[PDB]
Amino acid sequence: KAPAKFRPLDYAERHGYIRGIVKEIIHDPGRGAPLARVVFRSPYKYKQITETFIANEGMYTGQFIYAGKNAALTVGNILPLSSVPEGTVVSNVEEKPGDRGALGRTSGNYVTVVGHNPDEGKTRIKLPSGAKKVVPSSSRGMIGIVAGGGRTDKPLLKASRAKHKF
Amino acid sequence: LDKWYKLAKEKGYRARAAFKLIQLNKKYGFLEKAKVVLDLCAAPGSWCQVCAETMPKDSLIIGVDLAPIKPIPKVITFQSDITTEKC
Amino acid sequence: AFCKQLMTLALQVPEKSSQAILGLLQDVVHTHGRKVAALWNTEERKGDGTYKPLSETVEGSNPFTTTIWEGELLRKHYCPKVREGLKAMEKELRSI
Amino acid sequence: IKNKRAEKAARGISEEEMFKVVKTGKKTHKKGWKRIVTKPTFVGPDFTRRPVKYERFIRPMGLRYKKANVTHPTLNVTVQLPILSVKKNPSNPLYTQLGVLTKGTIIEVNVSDLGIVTASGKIAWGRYAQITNNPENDGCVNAVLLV
Amino acid sequence: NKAAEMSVDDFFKGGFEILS
Amino acid sequence: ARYTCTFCGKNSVRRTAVGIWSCKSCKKTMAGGAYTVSTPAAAAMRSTLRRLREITEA
Amino acid sequence: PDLQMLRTRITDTIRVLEDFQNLAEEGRSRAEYTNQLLKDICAYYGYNEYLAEKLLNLFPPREAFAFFEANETPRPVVIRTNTLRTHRRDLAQALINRGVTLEPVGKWSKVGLQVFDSKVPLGATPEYLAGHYILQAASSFLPVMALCPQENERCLDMAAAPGGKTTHMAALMKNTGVIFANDPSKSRAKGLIGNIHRLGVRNTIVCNYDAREFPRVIGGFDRVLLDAPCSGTGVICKDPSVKTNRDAKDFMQLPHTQKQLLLAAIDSCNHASKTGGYIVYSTCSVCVEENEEVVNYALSRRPNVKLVETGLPFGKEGFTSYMGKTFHPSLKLTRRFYPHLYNVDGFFVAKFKKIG
Amino acid sequence: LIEGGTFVTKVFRSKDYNKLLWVCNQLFTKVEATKPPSSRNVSAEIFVV
Amino acid sequence: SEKFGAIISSFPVLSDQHPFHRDLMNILYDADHFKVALGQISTAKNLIETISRDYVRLLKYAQSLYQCKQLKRAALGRMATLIKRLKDPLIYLDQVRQHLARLPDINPTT
RNA sequence: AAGCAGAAUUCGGUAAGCGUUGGAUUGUUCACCCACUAAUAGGGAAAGCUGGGGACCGUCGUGAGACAGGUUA
RNA sequence: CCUUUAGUCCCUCGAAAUUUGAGGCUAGAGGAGAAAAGUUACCACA
RNA sequence: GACCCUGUUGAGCUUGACUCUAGUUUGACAUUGUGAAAAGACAUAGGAGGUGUAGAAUAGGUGGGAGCUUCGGCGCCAGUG
Ligand SMILES: [Zn+2]
């Protein structure tokens, strides 16, 4: 269908909030994560933007989602890592502001922030593989669990780390 | 100017290379029931046109060429090259 | 016209006469085939008139507008040779 | 008018080849058989069968026109409007039947884009227009609406 | 084939198929 | 299996895709897991999300 | 103005009307919400006010937008196989061999075929010139399925200018009986005669009469078919002149002529018929002043006819009540068709049985 | 290409013509050059299947 | 066609440039206006080609010197009119070319 | 004369003194690629070799052609 | 006998209700005679 | 070669009066009976009914109607029509 990409960098999203409506969700071969067909409103032109997100677990069709810095902290909205507070589950996060989402797109992963750094704004994010990363606060991220489930069959054991384990 | 040059104009093909595939198909029916054909070079698209009119229904024909090709119905056209692993 | 009339003939004749006609139409179906195939296929029936059984001429009757229904009586004919003979004709038809 | 068209969009064989096919059967060729109409013409339908009266007048593809620059006298503007039919060529009744477009020829054009309101309140869809140029010398058709 | 084989006069004697 | 619907309020939900559910009464589609509409883990974090939202607002 | 701006307002106005109870403004009523929906629909889709409000009253909001979207998009080309010459499987196969993409038009007709595209002109193909198919419209199939004519009857087709329907009755009659094909226009009658001869029909009489003179002329028909001339509100895609050239004056003369035509069809038929005394009235319009108002008039001034089950598989029930107009309850048997629901032209079928 | 597929190529006749033919020999089962009549007789082109 | 093609091909294609040069040109020359200007040149080049094709067909059916001369004048006169419409785009491109010729050479990766 | 820095050019003026090539034409097309060179400008005398690519009657018929029938520059 | 033109809003018929359509009236225009006749910037032959 | 005309032919257009009537054809009526089994429309006496959209909601329709009340629910009024 189309790659799952965020909105382009613009003044309206980085300083306000934009309303958008989703119409349906489509499954595509090659992955289990269900794409979400969304229609937005152009602040400058009387035209609708055809872009595709990834449907998180729990959302439906027909939200007036808010896209911006001061959007509602609910499932289905996106928000810069600066605004969202500690311990919150985030999905499809951006390594840098402008890559339109890079980390955590497979069916069920999530990222929880474990600390914000105000001065020289940086946000710390934990990877599904158990890694620790620091990303700029200006990056965006989808809130919630990406749909797909099936997280009861993940074997996490290593020959070497077991020897490392106390 | 040639006999096949004139007769191709009246038949509506893009070049006389279309007939080369036509007589080849007559000798060897590879363009028969089999479904998938890959045309690695169709600059005018004549071979794609010939395929588009003799394959079984619901077949797949894909043609690539460095030069742009005017769209032919029931034919997939590529602007990419051939000597590149992107292609 | 003769094929339809001959199945009607086969219905009401002695066992050997019925067998002989049945064998004859087996050759007729085999040699011609598609010329008489539409008689045994209801979808290929012509719809440009009605069948006239008692026509004064061969072409006067409209024989491609009817269907050979007599197989449903000859399949239960008392003579095993006739029943095998009928099955012979359909086997040729199915192989057309 | 252009903007209205822009949003709306966002929402057989030739006579000459037919003559070649026919003359193939009739191998003996009579001198002067083909009459190529060297005047600009309008036909319309892609494929049609002509009466034996006119099955000898061949009109080349290159001389065919489908639109014209039509000027509205009252609303001082001109718009490219498609040609619907040729009504009268005041030089030869044969030319009218053949659709020959000469100077002073009355044609019927589709004026739906302009939006002319009639006395009954309807929107006009077809009006007469007189060709005011020489399409044979100037490679186009110019007309003035008869309104 | 079959038509010729059944067309010969010695097919229609009258022999009953119980007294073979 | 057949699951309950939040909007229509009746047992009229079926699986359509790997992670897509649909109810044909109100024509509403659910975005959930491979076999369950709502994962127990998904419920826990949403509860945690609600709790921290109350804490932030308080 | 800005046409894409109008589309946004159209969509915005519709959702407001759907959820006006909770989503509204300070003091503006839904009366001027609908009125705003009137202007921007008129300006965007090129309708005049009289027809647009007429169409908006017919449908509710979100279905109405689907109707206006359907009217701009063309309809698929469908062909009708001539049963007098062949059946569908060969004609599909014969055209497939020539490069025509075909599927059955649906499960409701054993005779119609749907065409996507072709590499040859569809109206010049050799089996076309042989009389094996005719280009028709899917809505034109319906009236003859309601009025199924059997062999050895007399039929009256009161408007057969194209000729698709008259040929269909001949095919169902197997070229037996008599068909009175009638057109009030000599120019259009020549095409009907050509269609009849091309398709191999031998049991027809082409007469050039006004359809209101027929009981005087002959009378006594077993089955009478009536496609009344109408506004053309269901054929808007082919004829865009309907969008702006239909006012209150037109919608007053048209039902009057249609009412006069229907009474003529009733008197033309034979109640004491050995096979049937059926009358089918059809229209390519969606307006209620031309459908279920003419039908009510016939039932109220001829108490010797009764509406019967139409017999078509798909369709929507007719309207029993409207803007203060109460109809006979039997009108629920009449059927309607819409482009957005079924990909066929706006149409209306009614079927009568004569009993005296 | 699937086992049993057919591969056809236009090959100019030269001293590399035989070296390319050896490739289809070790990679396919049946080989042949055709030169259909439409190809100009003056031309050195040939079609190998 | 040759002169139009030279103008289109000589100017840099902003997509293929290094990101630093792509952004610097956008600020300097209003990349949106740059694409609009080149499109009109491309549009005018195609239109002139279709005019030439149309009048060559007409000339092949012409019947006298006067008719041939009028068609040639019409073909040339229409080509002249299209170029006159290119007045504003051509002024813009000349200014950009002079500015580009004087730009310093910055190696993005050094 | 031109943002013409240099180099390379572009547009225009006087100028016919002096030159204006070797191959392909073996795949496709609006027939035109490979180079070498300072450059590979266009025409008139309008011309010959070489490859490519008839017209009258007569008879029998005409919804239409046929003739090893006759004559001839 | 139908169709057009202008008129009194003069009569009848049908329709819808807060108006129409078709007839009717006044006087202009179209339609020796089943033998054939007239006519065409058209076609074929002479 | 093209242009104008004539004769024959083909394609096409127009005319080919009016009044009765043969033929042909549509509708209604008459001979012309008796029974029986069904169907329709007329006769009463009953019973049950009204869902296009919006309206909370299944609005036959027409008239009064701002107050009625198994005394707590309704009305009006505001909507929507
Ligand atoms: Zn539901």
Short mmCIF file of N, CA and C and ligand atoms in Angstrom, two decimals, chain F residues 5-10 12-13 23-28, ligand 1:
data_model
loop_
_atom_site.label_atom_id
_atom_site.label_comp_id
_atom_site.label_asym_id
_atom_site.label_seq_id
_atom_site.Cartn_x
_atom_site.Cartn_y
_atom_site.Cartn_z
N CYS F 5 -18.90 -5.82 21.49
CA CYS F 5 -18.68 -4.54 20.84
C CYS F 5 -18.88 -3.40 21.83
N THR F 6 -17.94 -2.45 21.83
CA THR F 6 -18.04 -1.32 22.74
C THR F 6 -19.10 -0.32 22.28
N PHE F 7 -19.16 -0.04 20.98
CA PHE F 7 -20.08 0.97 20.48
C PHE F 7 -21.51 0.43 20.37
N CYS F 8 -21.70 -0.61 19.56
CA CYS F 8 -23.04 -1.18 19.40
C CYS F 8 -23.54 -1.87 20.66
N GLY F 9 -22.63 -2.25 21.56
CA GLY F 9 -23.03 -2.81 22.84
C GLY F 9 -23.54 -4.23 22.80
N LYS F 10 -23.34 -4.95 21.70
CA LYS F 10 -23.82 -6.32 21.57
C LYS F 10 -22.72 -7.21 21.00
N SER F 12 -21.31 -8.78 18.52
CA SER F 12 -21.36 -8.84 17.06
C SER F 12 -20.01 -8.48 16.44
N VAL F 13 -18.92 -8.97 17.01
CA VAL F 13 -17.58 -8.67 16.51
C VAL F 13 -16.92 -9.96 16.02
N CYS F 23 -17.27 -5.16 13.29
CA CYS F 23 -18.67 -5.41 13.62
C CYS F 23 -19.53 -4.82 12.51
N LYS F 24 -20.42 -5.64 11.95
CA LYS F 24 -21.20 -5.24 10.78
C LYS F 24 -22.47 -4.49 11.13
N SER F 25 -22.81 -4.36 12.41
CA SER F 25 -24.01 -3.62 12.79
C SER F 25 -23.83 -2.12 12.57
N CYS F 26 -22.86 -1.52 13.26
CA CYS F 26 -22.55 -0.11 13.11
C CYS F 26 -21.37 0.14 12.18
N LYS F 27 -20.82 -0.91 11.57
CA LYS F 27 -19.69 -0.81 10.65
C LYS F 27 -18.50 -0.11 11.31
N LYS F 28 -18.11 -0.64 12.47
CA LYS F 28 -16.97 -0.14 13.23
C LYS F 28 -15.90 -1.22 13.27
ZN ZN M 1 -20.52 -2.82 16.71
#
